[PDB]
């Protein structure tokens, strides 16, 4: 059910490519790309939460993303996933996006901010769906054959595949300090702030409102946000709180792998001619098609080849 | 197909971290010295080395 994200918030994470070729800390970042399904469907895990907005109410039209120490909402219609051409997103829930993507070498997930700015994260990822059957086809045909395969279903129920969410670490921020003539002033904007200084009064402390510390420089003080009222996924892209894990939350991973049938095409009838102990087959493949043959005696003498163009073979 | 589970790394600054051996299927743990990680808001913590 959608009621799992009640006390969870999205998180900013390091991204190797933010669109301009430079790594940066993005609201959206790719954690894991799962392609266990054999029909090509991709389950992409991102730091965003889709389908649940702020104020903790389910809404399929909105997603929520961390902006600056606090989440904010955006419209889902701006979400895009691409490898080399835009992908068709078949589903979304929380941190997980179910999409279908063309063959490619990278994977970029992005959206539009509330301030009408674009955010995107790009990860190197070799996407190439495995061949189902003996024909390398590009889209399911009108007329053909059915073969077993595995896909990601649309179901968002609990799947006993579980992901841990625990209390996020202290969030450092250099913006919290303003220098005025040797006085470091710490703003709060509504969040508890830890500070530690080696100037003036070297005594570190904790605030909930603005403070000023005299005879100090912005260089020699540290600030962070500590009172975190929501817990986030223990992603490998955020530091841990202590030697042990906080645990304290759990989220089911939706779209379980399920066990279906895929449609594959059947090649055209080849033109067959006969000769003395010889069969001359002229073949018209629309797409790379496997041709194999064997003897039915004691020696199979199996032979195979991928026919890609109109070809005459004598067997 | 296997999946690699990686809990969040432990950044212990102004100190030295350590971990204990576990009995997980293929468990690997290590401590790296002299790291100075940054977050989106800046450096994670003061002590520079």
């Amino acid at each position: 059910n959608f009621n799992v994200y009640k006390a969870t918030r999205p998180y900013l994470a390091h991204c190797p490519d933010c669109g301009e070729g430079h790594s940066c800390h993005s609201p959206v970042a790719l954690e894991r790309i799962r392609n266990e399904a054999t029909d090509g469907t991709l389950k992409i895990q991102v730091s965003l939460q889709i389908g649940i907005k702020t104020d903790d109410s389910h809404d399929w039209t909105k997603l929520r993303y961390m902006d600056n120490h606090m989440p904010a909402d955006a419209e889902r219609a701006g979400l895009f996933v691409r490898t080399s051409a835009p992908c068709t997103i078949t589903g979304t829930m929380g941190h997980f996006i179910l999409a279908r993507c063309p063959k490619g070498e990278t994977l970029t997930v992005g959206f539009t901010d509330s301030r009408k700015i674009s955010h995107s994260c790009t990860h190197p990822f070799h996407h190439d769906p495995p061949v189902i059957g003996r024909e390398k086809f590009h889209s399911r045909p009108q007329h053909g054959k059915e073969l077993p395969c595995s896909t990601y279903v649309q179901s968002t129920a609990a799947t006993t595949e579980e992901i841990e969410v625990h209390m996020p670490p202290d969030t450092p921020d250099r913006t919290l300090m303003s220098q005025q003539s040797g006085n470091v002033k710490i703003t709060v904007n509504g969040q508890t702030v830890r500070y530690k200084c080696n100037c003036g009064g070297s005594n570190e402390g904790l605030t909930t409102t603005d403070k000023v510390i005299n005879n100090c420089k912005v260089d020699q003080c540290h600030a962070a946000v500590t009172n975190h009222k929501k817990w986030q996924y223990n992603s490998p892209l955020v530091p841990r709180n202590a030697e042990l894990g906080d645990r304290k939350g759990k989220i089911h991973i939706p779209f379980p792998l399920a066990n279906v049938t895929c449609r594959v095409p059947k090649a055209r009838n080849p033109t067959v001619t006969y000769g003395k102990n010889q069969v001359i087959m002229l073949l018209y493949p629309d797409h790379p098609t496997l041709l194999s043959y064997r003897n039915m005696g004691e020696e199979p003498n199996y032979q195979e080849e991928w026919v890609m163009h109109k070809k005459e073979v004598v067997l | 197909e296997y999946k690699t589970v990686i809990p969040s790394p432990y950044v212990k600054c102004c100190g030295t971290a350590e971990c204990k051996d576990k009995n997980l299927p293929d468990y690997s743990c290590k401590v790296f010295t002299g790291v100075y990680p940054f977050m989106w808001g800046g450096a994670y913590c003061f002590c520079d080395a």
Epitope: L206, T207, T209, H228, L244 | -
Partner: antibody
Framework: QVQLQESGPGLVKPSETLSLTCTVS??????????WGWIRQPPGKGLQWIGS???????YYNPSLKSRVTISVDTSKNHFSLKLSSVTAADTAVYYC?????????????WGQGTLVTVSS | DIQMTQSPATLSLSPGERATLFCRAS??????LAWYQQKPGQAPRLLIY???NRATGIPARFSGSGSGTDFTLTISSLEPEDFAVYYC??????????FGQGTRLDTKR
């Protein structure tokens, strides 16, 4: 959930070292994100704060008493201890050990059974 | 430092009636105020944190409100078990962590 139990001499002399050890039950030091600390209240007065210990390695002390107040933790036998040196008669008060299990702030919501500390006579 | 003053120093009011207590701050602490209960022979007990909501096991009879430098604690009805000495604590700027001097709650006679 978790419980606190204080232990100490109770009666001290002038210039003597006061040591109070609070042992934790139903839990351990290596636990979720929260604080430890010690509180004291003179009879007929409000509560006064001595110090607090955060598991991250930092310690916080009351500036008026920070010069003598030392807070340590023994994770092996699983307690935290407060030491006040050169205790004077003005420090006679009921002491408690405390912690704030939830939300990791400066408040307190768990307690032991505090003991009276008298210094003179 | 920041100092809290409670009002009244002593309050006497009959069981089963609505009660009100005031805590005033020397400096604005937003909502960083906690309302605390203590009984003779008992350790202090937390009732309200951040001047809102309530800790686990604390019923709805206590209601905290206020902001800035002025905060109020409202008791919908005093049952016979609710008579104790109450305190207000600020955490807006600590160390040191500051508590109120205490208000005495009595039953009117």
């Amino acid at each position: 959930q978790v419980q606190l139990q204080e232990s100490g001499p109770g009666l001290v002399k002038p210039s003597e070292t006061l040591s109070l050890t609070c042992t934790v039950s139903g839990g351990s030091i290596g636990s979720s994100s929260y604080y430890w600390g010690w509180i004291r209240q003179p009879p007929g007065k409000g509560l006064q704060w001595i110090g607090s210990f955060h598991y991250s390695g930092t310690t916080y002390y009351n500036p008026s008493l920070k010069s003598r107040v030392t807070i340590s933790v023994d994770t092996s036998k699983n307690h935290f201890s407060l030491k006040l040196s050169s205790v004077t008669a003005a420090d006679t008060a009921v002491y408690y050990c405390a912690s704030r299990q939830n939300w990791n702030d400066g408040y307190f919501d768990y307690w032991g059974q505090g003991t009276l500390v008298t210094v003179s006579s | 430092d920041i100092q809290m003053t409670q009002s009244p120093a002593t309050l006497s009011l009959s069981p089963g009636e609505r009660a009100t207590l005031f805590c005033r701050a020397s400096q604005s602490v937003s909502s960083s105020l906690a309302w605390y209960q203590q009984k003779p022979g008992q350790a202090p007990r937390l009732l309200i944190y951040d001047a809102s909501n309530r800790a686990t096991g604390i019923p709805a009879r206590f209601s905290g409100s206020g902001s800035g430098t002025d905060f109020t604690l409202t008791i919908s009805s005093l049952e016979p078990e609710d008579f104790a000495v109450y305190y207000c604590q600020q955490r807006g700027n600590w160390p040191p962590i500051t508590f109120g001097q205490g208000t005495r709650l009595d039953t009117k006679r």
